[PDB]
Amino acid sequence: HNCFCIQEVVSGLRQPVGALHSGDGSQRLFILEKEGYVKILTPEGEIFKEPYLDIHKLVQSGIKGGDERGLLSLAFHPNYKKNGKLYVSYTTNQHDHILRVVEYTVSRKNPHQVDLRTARVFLEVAELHRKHLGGQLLFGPDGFLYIILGDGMITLDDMESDFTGSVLRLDVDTDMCNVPYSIPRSNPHFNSTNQPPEVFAHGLHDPGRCAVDRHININLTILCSDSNGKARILQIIKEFKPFSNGPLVGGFVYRGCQSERLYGSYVFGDRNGNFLTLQQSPVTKQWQEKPLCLGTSGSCRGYFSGHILGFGEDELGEVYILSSSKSMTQTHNGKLYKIVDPKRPLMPEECRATVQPAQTLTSECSRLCRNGYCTPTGKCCCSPGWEGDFCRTAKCEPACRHGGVCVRPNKCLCKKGYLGPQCEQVD
Amino acid sequence: HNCFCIQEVVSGLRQPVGALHSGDGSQRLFILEKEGYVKILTPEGEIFKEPYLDIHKLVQSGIKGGDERGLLSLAFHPNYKKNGKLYVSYTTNQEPHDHILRVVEYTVSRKNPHQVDLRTARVFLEVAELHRKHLGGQLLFGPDGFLYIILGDGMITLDDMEEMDGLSDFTGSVLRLDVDTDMCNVPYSIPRSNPHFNSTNQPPEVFAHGLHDPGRCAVDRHPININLTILCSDSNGSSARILQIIKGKDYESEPSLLEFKPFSNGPLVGGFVYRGCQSERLYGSYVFGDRNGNFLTLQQSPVTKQWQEKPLCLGTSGSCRGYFSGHILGFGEDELGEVYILSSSKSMTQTHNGKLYKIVDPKRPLMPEECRATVQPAQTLTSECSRLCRNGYCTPTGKCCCSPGWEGDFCRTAKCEPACRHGGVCVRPNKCLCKKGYLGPQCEQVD
Amino acid sequence: KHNCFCIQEVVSGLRQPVGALHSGDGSQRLFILEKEGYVKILTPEGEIFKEPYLDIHKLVQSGIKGGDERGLLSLAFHPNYKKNGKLYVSYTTNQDHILRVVEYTVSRKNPHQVDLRTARVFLEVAELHRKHLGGQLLFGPDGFLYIILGDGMITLDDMEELSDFTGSVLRLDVDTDMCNVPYSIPRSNPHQPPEVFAHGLHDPGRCAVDRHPINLTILCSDSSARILQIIKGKDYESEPSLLEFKNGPLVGGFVYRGCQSERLYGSYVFGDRNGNFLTLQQSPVTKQWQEKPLCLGTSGSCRGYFSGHILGFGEDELGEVYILSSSKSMTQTHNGKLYKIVDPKRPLMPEECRATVQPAQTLTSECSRLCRNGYCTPTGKCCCSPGWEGDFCRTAKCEPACRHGGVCVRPNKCLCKKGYLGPQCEQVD
């Protein structure tokens, strides 16, 4: 057989929706739980007791299976190793609910938990329903943040926002302390003032997890599965197939090292673990499906528990399955499964990488900027009432007098003998 | 009424940390900048363009407020007018540890009395440091002629010591070295009066220990039947305490000479003993002050011999004002004995506008008849050592210590080992200039 | 150099300071004059108020070239300013140009700002050139206003006309009740136009004015150096200096009547552009004038020099004197400085020189409180605007008069009784 196999890595999870790495060399795997938690899995296989991110109070999650509200996606800044920037999309309530896209920053004190005080709202998408929400975040090799939103089943209500069913592309590397993101010049509606500049492409309804090929001859490829009504696949570069009888969870482009034959393949799978591969003809540019099969080889088995909720990718490129059921949710037993090529060793010699354990932030901005926030580029944006280079000097208007010092905004520390808000009074 | 006043002398300084004179009669004031500069203020009120000392590349200085790294202290040898010797303590990181607190000896340029010859650096001590607070390192000479070094505890915990990675037996102690030595191996010798000079357990340099985060210490010279008095402010952990320094005491287990809750604007920056001339009433008094210019006087009860704090007030009299800009960073004393405060703020640092302020007694003239002194302008080095000793270094006493490969009274003759042969001349150490007919590194072979 | 004085910097960041003075209201404020047309307040604690005391830089024509004397020239506070808030200002404007002397009044709402609407033009002297302008304002111990004007004109220019006032010392009485003319002529004036008290000056520096003398004394410098004593009805053309001395010509002078310096009391001090000072003192024995040099020397922080060139002098309410300096370099950098003269032989605050600040109060006179449709004379009489009459000008005047019992509410506006129409209620309905 040419089949692959599924190996259980961890269990005891709650409604896992995805997993990914930070690209800092630490080979940590960050697991997303719908209720609003992000947990760390170390390379030795331990789950840290303290969540990396706990926002379950902010997050509105649904009870019933099929309620898509919750924590949707996470993307680490391409330069997270130096600036500790990460991005999160979740649902909350204030007009049913509102889909947020927020930036967070890792604690300068602890590289394994996020400083919750560093939240910055980037986008707030008004939502009217609880399905077709999308919410995937990813960075392209251009360095830009892509946001993939469903349509939220809005149509006649649209006549009465404007971001649903589109792929947004923001530039998070801005110096303007006014706006959290700037629009890249390449966007199709930059400075048009008729369509939103953030919109890069539209027309999505209920997209699954999109496969992201990163490859020279082409910069970036995003393939999405989509099921408006009972499936179709869509390409964004720099209707694609008549397959039937499926509802696809999503897909990935395998760039791992354990499987030689799977390299470069687009893999898609449905709720029940039926996997297919997509192959484009370089000659005819037409897409074709071949099933990918699972079979048991010792410990790694040709099956897994429950239903697929999302996919994972570690820093070495190996891909994962995240599963749960209605039985596994109340029992608090979601699982993380690795996809293995049983034809190949578990650690082929060429696939070894040395763990570089995660270090605290070393950048000049995080170290000295305290009365404001740090942009991903490093500019320290001061809070109101501060103006230093790192916002360390307070502003007092009117100025402190009789030698007073402006210690905090509009607060004068007077010398003995001088009173009043600006030390203007004598005796 | 009975207040003092504060007079601005110069501005445009960069994070000044202290000021002092060289005792050579020139009435120059040397101002210390944290980033690693020493500037000269002439008696006529001029700041020289060229710094007296520029070691800002050597110096590791800190950005954060509360980051104490930088140029810490300076002390002129008691005989600087004759030998041009000065001592400097700064933090650097060029040699495990966080940074290293060095105490170095420099010597004024023999061509220019207003610049120090940077090539004459001699490292005396290198104290490994682990943190960036409680590390203050004040340098001063007592009337014994010895160099006192006052080091904080560098916030080094007891478990840090159990590894003894960087020896740092010196933190939290007062070191006392004898710099007037002739041994060219060691830079300083230990005075026999030291309490541990033979003890193989305690360090011989340690004169007293038990300090944590001491401010600038007041140095009375009695210029009261005792030879030496040194008072330091100290923060045991907030409830500021003041300490008298006497041979071989441990100030975790020694009574603090006074304890008073702070004024809440800041802990005590430090203090001085006023031996100036402009103010009659202030003579002999111990003054201490906090970050915000709250000044105290220490007065002993003749009845109980107990010390007590008494406040001093500031008030405006024309140009002389009862306030000043920013926060106190350090103190100053000129050659006539008048005391100064150096101030800066967060706003004054980026503007590069630290200031030097003179403390004035407005009840007295600015130049009372008796306080007049004649300026003796600084002269270049005339000592026999600086003039003739060229292949080595000069000890503060005058002995010329040769570099490896040199000998002579003033190290003027090179050494060749093995010696040059057949009339050859030893021109540089281990280089023979042979006469024609004789070859080889020592002219040993005959042709 | 045992007897020198010293210079202590008080404030900087000024722009072309030309003088400083106090208001004699007990507040110990020091009012600094900036050439471009500003007057700034320096508090005794050494602060400069953000808002100027007087901002007339739009009205003022000031000069660019070094040696162009146009700008704000002088300021003098009325001797009773604490009660009536009257001040006088001399500046140049061009509507070559015209040297104006105007009266202002401190805002009834704010004692630290001048009500710009209370201007009263007293004199308008036509000028033809930009040098030799003088224009010093001062009140003598007689209570009269003295105005000291230079002359930048030539005889050919006189015939082509305009100013009967240039090169004279005018003496006006500002304490008048006549609402027609802003000033009346004192009977003692030698009555040249009646305003002239003495004439014949050319290019005078700042004149010293002694108080606490039995006599009246005003000394002026004039262009080795020439100094003049001013007396009623005197022609100073071709008149010798009091003494011969001798280096720049003299900027001006003052009489030290301060308290910090014992030895300097009663002396006249003069200085040139570069800080070379001389002193004139009358001998108590023979009443004769005598010259003594005054030197500057460093005493610790107090220094025997200063930056740039002297532009004018200052005097605070306690009588201590000041130097105002700038250079061609300090003007572009916008860094003029105010320097205090100190006697280092004496304490900075001698026991006997202490005075308590009486902070400035809003106007309390009956006139400023009740006179609303006119202006207040320094005496207290309320002078009505056209179309108003009465003790406090509170009753409007209607011409022709209102008829049929109508009430004259606003000037030439009748409030008619029911049954009567028209601008004077002349028509019956």
Ligand SMILES: O=C(O)[C@@H]1O[C@@H](O[C@H]2[C@H](O)[C@@H](COS(=O)(=O)O)O[C@H](O[C@H]3[C@H](O)[C@@H](OS(=O)(=O)O)[C@H](O[C@H]4[C@H](O)[C@@H](NS(=O)(=O)O)[C@@H](O[C@H]5[C@H](O)[C@@H](OS(=O)(=O)O)[C@H](O[C@H]6[C@H](O)[C@@H](NS(=O)(=O)O)[C@@H](O[C@H]7[C@H](O)[C@@H](OS(=O)(=O)O)[C@H](O[C@H]8[C@H](O)[C@@H](NS(=O)(=O)O)[C@@H](O)O[C@@H]8COS(=O)(=O)O)O[C@H]7C(=O)O)O[C@@H]6COS(=O)(=O)O)O[C@H]5C(=O)O)O[C@@H]4COS(=O)(=O)O)O[C@H]3C(=O)O)[C@@H]2NS(=O)(=O)O)[C@H](OS(=O)(=O)O)[C@@H](O)[C@@H]1O
């Ligand atoms: O403000 C205030 O005040 C408020 O507050 C609050 O409140 C709330 C709360 O909260 C909640 C809770 O909470 S807690 O606390 O408790 O936690 O509650 C509430 O609410 C909620 C609830 O729930 C309710 O209400 S009440 O009142 O009632 O209670 C509601 O709910 C709802 C929902 O919402 C809806 N949805 S939507 O979307 O529309 O909106 C619905 O649901 C439905 C649907 O359908 C679904 O869902 S989802 O999610 O998905 O969307 C589900 O479904 C299901 C079904 O039904 C079933 N069936 S049965 O019959 O069994 O029943 C199943 O399935 C099935 C079927 O049939 C199929 O399927 S399908 O898809 O098609 O449908 C299939 O078929 C099959 C067959 O069957 C066979 N045959 S036989 O015969 O044998 O059977 C064969 O043929 O085979 C086939 C196959 O086929 S295929 O497909 O495969 O080809 O299958 C079957 C089976 O069985 O298997 O199942 C499903 C699933 O399930 S689950 O579990 O997931 O669910 O569901 C449904 C139902 O209905 O159930 O509806 C619901 C109900 O409604 S009513 O009417 O009732 O109203 O609402 C909710 C909400 O959310 O709200 C409360 N309220 S109150 O007022 O009451 O108080 C809140 O807040 S928070 O914070 O919480 O948020 C709010 O409200 C406010 O704020």
